[PDB]
Every structure is written in C-alpha cells, then in structure tokens.
Design a protein around this ligand. Structure first.
Ligand code: AMP
Length: 646
DNA sequence: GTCCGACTACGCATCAGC
DNA sequence: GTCGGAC
C-alpha cells in the first residue's frame, strides 16, 4: 500500500489489513509521521493513545524488531537516560542544515522559523532542491533512529559539519510530512501533545489487544472482542499498571521491550524488578499553596514534615558486590561526579548492610563554618572525571527515603517502615551524612514554626508525606504523592518585585504568533538607567498573554532607548518603550554573571537576577520611575537567610 | 487531578573561528 | 524549576 494514505486513527483499525507495509519489512518513517499527524490533530489524550496503540499494534504484528525505535521516536528519546546520549545540535545548526537542504539563505529560514515558531513548518514547505535529483530511497523508522544516534555520537573538532551533513541527508530523503517531524525532533520540540505517560498507555494497550510472540498471520489481533465496555476498561488499566509500575522500577526500554516481546506483559515483573545499579524513577512532589491545603488532600491521615534542602537529588545504589553508583533525578549517571561520596559510603551504614538504594539530597557544605551553602555554590563542582583530591566544594548528604535494603525491595512498604529501616541501619555523621530534619505532628502552629525554622536553617520550605495511608514508593499509582510547601507559594511572603518591561521575545509552539517571553529591568537611580534583571515567561494566562501582545506591540522600538542596559542578556526580538510595570514574584535572588541589575552594590563584577520569576499582575498605577530600584534589589538579596548565614 | 508543553537562572563542558 | 490549558 501507500504510506502516504496511512490512517492509524480510523474506526475499526486492523493491525494487518490497515497497515502500509508488508510483514518482515522495516516500518516506513512516513507511517510514523502519519501517526504523528493524527496525534497532533486531536486534543483528547484517549484519542491520542488509541492512534499510537494502533501503530504499535501493526508493528508488534508485522515488524517486531522495529518496536524499540518507533517507541523512542514517539518519545523523542535517543535511548536510556543513564547512557547520556545527547544530540549536540543547536537551533542555529539545525537552521543552517535546513537552509542548505532547501537551497535558501540562512536569514530567510531564520526569519520564517521565528515568525512561525516552528522549524518543522519551514523545513517541510521548502523543496526547491527536491526537483533537482531523483527521489532517494524512502526513510525507515529504524534508519531514521540510527541516524539520530549517529548525530549524537559525533564528537570533537569539525563534528558540527558532520552533524549537518547527516541532517541534510535526512531532509533530502524526506517526503510529505517527514521533514516537519524530523526537524521538530532535532530541535527537541516534537509538539505532539503525547509523551511518556501516554506512550506507556499506548504500549500496554497495543500488546494487550495484539499480543506479541505470535505466528503470522496473527491468531489474535484484538483480545478485547468478546468483552463489555466496563470489562475491557478495567482489563486495560490492570495491564497498563503492570507496565507502568515496572517502568518506574526500570525506566529502560532497552531492557523492557526485549523481555516484553518474549514473555509478554504478564511475566514482565518477574524479569524486570528493582535492583541496585539500575536507576529508578524518583518520587515527585505536588506544590501546595498553604498549610490548610495540606490538611485537605491528606484528610485524616497522619503525615510527617521534613526540611526541603536546596541541593541536587542523589539516588545512591550500593550493590551486593560493594560497587557504588549514584544517579540524578533524570536517571543520569552521577557516579564520577561525587568521588568524595564514594569514599564515605563505609561511614554511613552498619556492618550488617549488604545492599541498599538511598534517596538523598546532595547539599554543598562549608566545613570551616559548619553551615549549608546555597545551590549556586553546589553547581560550581565538576561534572565528570573528578578526582577526590581536587574536590573544592564539599557535599553533605541528607537522606530522606530508603528503597532497597539487603536484597529486598521496600517499594510497596509504607513510609513509616522505610523511615524506620533507614534509621536503624544508618549512622549520623554530621556535615557528611545526616537525616532530614523531621517533625511528625498535626498542629498548625507547630507546622508554621517548622516552616519558618527551615528557611532560617538555609532551606526552601517543607516536604509533607503521609506515613501509613497511601505512603508507598509506587510512582505508577501517583507520581506526585508528596507535597511541597514553600514560602513563595503563600500570597503574603512579600518577595514581589515591580519591574519594567523593556523587551519581548517571539514565542514558539504553544506561543507561536505572540510573545513567549519578556525582558524585565530595574531602575538604577544613581546611573539613571534601567538595568535588565531577568526574563519572564510564566505566570500569564492565555488571555493575558494576548492582551500583553496587543498592548505592547504599539511600544515596539527599532532600537533600544539610550538609558537601557542589558549587558550580556539575550538581545530581545522586539525592543519596547519602557512604560509597562508588572508585579513579579520569585523564590530567591541570585548573583548573576550576565544581568547588570544592581551590579556593584553587592558584588564588584556581578549583578543580581531572580530565581524562578513568575508574573502576578500588571501595575497600572505605576510608571517606570516608581518601579523597584536596584538599591531595593541589593537589599532584598542581602536579607536572604542563606546570604545572612554567611 | 493528570498529563503535557509553554517558559525561568546558572555554570560546567564543548567547539567554531581565528 | 513555575505555570496554565484541555480533558
Ligand atoms: O521543587 P522540587 O520538585 O524540586 O522539590 C523536590 C525535590 O526537592 C529535593 N528535596 C529536598 N529535601 C527533600 C526531602 N526532605 N524529601 C524529598 N525531597 C527533598 C529533592 O531533590 C526532590 O526531588
């Protein structure tokens, strides 16, 4: 058949008959791109999962070995996260490859990509070089995926030119809508509306409806034929939960897909279980906007409150053989980053401990002062090839959960149990390995003082977790089972700044057409200058963003006003007449190496920016001169508890 | 509530142009 | 990291 007319969203989809490729033959990338079209067209997640499941069903029945690349293409992933593969292709490089492939000038394609907010639309609607040669052989799914890995593997000098040539070869072989999705994949903005959770749902539904390991033609193609609506409903969720719980234990398609294709979904938890050395998905936290919101949602269930430390999450694995591994919250290998940690594993556990998986937070520590250092100090550590002698920023560990212990998994255990084992079999070495400052209560005043004390002790806020009711480490049940209580979540903390809009940025994707971001500035009275302080991109409603785009479009200037100073900040696409004042909330103030706001008032060669800036409201009663001054910004930074604890 | 994709600062690691 | 939108 023709991959051009592939419709994986048709009613009564047959995996074998409605396919556009013969069995044993490699899956054409156009079939993947056609499935991406139908997925992008709809907004309901259930319709998106069904369309993908249909494509996965034809793959599992006609070309099983192509299931792994098709899943990775739908996720826009290069492979397992612990392998650390990265494309290494910037937007400027992708645009240079698009311009060279289409025969157009770089300025033409760059203006169009910014105006459209999508590189895929530019790379597709340009084929002035396709009428130059005979059509290259059609693209395959596994072939496109391997070429993506080829790009990611090129390193060293002159590697950029080699990446461009591979991207160029893909575009000249693209037909119909393939160029739009290949360019979207390289830029890291697939924009499908479907991601990890929906792919997992589509995979479990596809292998349940069309089981793998069958002979061809497949005896079973729709195992939900003789079932009722509520029966097929509850059967698919039970199957989807088996896949989701094991993927949370082993988020590695390279390990799950082969076992899946050989033993089926039923026997998967027997082969892929939680084990040290293999990173697992961490437990996340849902943001709570107040103490009262914690009493609800948890209702009549006992919980605990722990200090929210400002560092980097460290998932530490101790294998039975003695080898030690550390993983980030994205399952990235961080073992070579903490040699100081590895030397101290003996000092944290009892002689009876043989294997464990620890959930801790690596926080920068000052041994000469016995205090916690801010996150900016922690980020100055080296990332790889670190030798313990040259470690200049010490790290203190704050363990708050225990997942594995002596060969048994505690995932299905309540937090009250996991916390107990973590206390009995681990030792306190202050400034090295300490337990999270905990406090079990239900008193609002006690919780309020604990929230205050945490920030006095160089912490962001509190973490609230139940102890016995829904207090397991099963992410597939609820990925955000913990609660997050910070000061800036409450609407009275007062860290609101009134800043002037001095620039706008063209939006991409969901923000194509209007402004996606804005440049904010503070007024320096002594220099009579507006100093850029940060960029702003979140906090607007969709209706507010169109009001800003309309109101600020009249103030667009061809050149910046002479009294505006942005230093090394990103030059805005549209310079704006300094007139709009917006209220902006942030979590912290940081010493910036780029922004010139309040430079000299705290550090001689560094300014101040805002950590996690968000838009609150427009200050219509205010004018640029009445905005927050750089002197106020310098004082706000000084009054910070971590800055005061210095 | 869930899932997804807009967008933030920052600094190490990497590479093009000279 | 924060945030809002569609379901
Ligand atoms: O805001 P966020 O989602 O990054 O917060 C979650 C992260 O916060 C870190 N952290 C610090 N202290 C704790 C405690 N006591 N418990 C759990 N997490 C904690 C972690 O890095 C977490 O991912």
């Amino acid at each position: 058949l023709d991959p051009s007319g592939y419709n994986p969203a048709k009613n009564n989809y047959h995996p074998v008959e409605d396919a556009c490729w013969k069995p044993g033959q490699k899956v054409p990338y156009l079939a993947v791109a056609r499935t991406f079209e139908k997925i992008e067209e709809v907004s309901a997640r259930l319709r998106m999962v069904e369309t993908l499941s249909n494509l996965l069903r034809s793959v599992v029945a006609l070309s099983p070995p192509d299931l792994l690349p098709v899943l990775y293409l739908s996720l826009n992933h290069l492979g397992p996260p612990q392998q650390g593969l990265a494309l290494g292709v910037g937007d400027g490089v992708l645009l240079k490859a698009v311009a060279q492939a289409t025969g157009r000038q770089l300025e033409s394609v760059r203006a169009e990509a910014a105006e459209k907010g999508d590189v895929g639309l530019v790379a597709e609607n340009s084929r002035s070089t396709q009428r130059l040669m005979l059509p290259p052989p059609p693209l395959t799914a596994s072939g496109v995926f391997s070429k993506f890995r080829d790009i990611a593997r090129l390193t060293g000098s002159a590697s950029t030119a080699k990446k461009i040539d591979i991207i160029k070869g893909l575009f000249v072989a693209c037909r119909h809508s393939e160029a739009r999705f290949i360019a979207r994949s390289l830029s890291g903005r697939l924009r499908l509306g479907l991601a990890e959770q929906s792919v997992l749902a589509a995979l479990s539904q596809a292998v349940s409806l069309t089981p793998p390991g069958q002979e061809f033609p497949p005896a079973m193609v729709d195992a939900g034929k003789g079932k009722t609506a509520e029966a097929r409903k509850t059967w698919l969720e039970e199957q989807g939960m088996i896949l989701k719980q094991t993927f949370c234990e082993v988020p590695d398609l390279d390990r799950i897909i082969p076992v899946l294709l050989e033993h089926g979904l039923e026997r998967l938890p027997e082969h892929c279980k939680l084990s040290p050395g293999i990173p697992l998905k961490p437990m996340l936290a849902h943001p709570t906007r107040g103490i009262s919101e914690v009493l609800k949602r948890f209702e009549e269930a006992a919980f605990t409150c722990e200090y929210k430390y400002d560092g980097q999450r460290a998932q530490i694995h101790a294998l039975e053989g003695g080898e030690v591994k550390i993983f980030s919250r994205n399952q990235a290998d961080n073992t070579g980053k903490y040699p100081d940690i590895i030397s101290r594993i003996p000092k944290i556990k009892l002689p009876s401990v043989t294997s464990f998986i620890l959930d801790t937070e690596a926080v920068a520590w000052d041994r000469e002062k016995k205090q916690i250092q801010p996150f900016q100090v922690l980020t100055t550590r080296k990332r790889k090839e670190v030798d313990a002698s040259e470690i200049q920023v010490q790290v203190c560990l704050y363990a708050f959960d225990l997942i594995y212990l002596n060969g048994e998994s505690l995932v299905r255990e309540p937090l009250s149990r996991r916390r107990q084992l973590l206390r009995e079999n681990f030792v306190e070495t202050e400034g090295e390995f300490v337990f999270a400052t905990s406090l079990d209560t239900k008193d609002i005043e006690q919780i309020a003082e604990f929230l205050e004390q945490s920030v006095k002790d160089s912490c962001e806020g509190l973490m609230v977790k139940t102890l016995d009711v829904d207090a397991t480490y099963e992410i597939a049940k609820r990925s955000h089972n913990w609660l997050k209580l910070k000061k800036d979540y409450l609407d009275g903390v007062g860290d609101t700044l009134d800043l002037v809009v001095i620039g706008a940025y063209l939006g991409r994707g969901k923000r194509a057409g209007r402004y996606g971001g804005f440049l904010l500035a503070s007024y320096d009275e002594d220099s009579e200058e507006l100093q850029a302080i940060c960029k702003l991109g979140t906090g607007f409603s969709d209706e507010e963003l169109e009001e800003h785009h309309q109101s600020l479009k009249a103030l667009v200037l061809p050149s910046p006003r002479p009294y505006v100073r942005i230093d090394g900040a990103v030059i805005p696409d549209h310079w704006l007449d300094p007139s709009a004042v917006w209220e902006v909330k942030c979590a912290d103030l940081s010493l910036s190496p780029i922004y010139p706001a309040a430079r000299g008032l705290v550090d001689s060669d560094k300014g101040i920016s805002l950590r996690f800036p968000r838009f609150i409201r427009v200050r219509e009663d205010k004018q640029p001169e009445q905005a927050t001054t750089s002197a106020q910004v310098a004082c706000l930074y000084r009054k910070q508890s971590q800055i005061q604890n210095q």
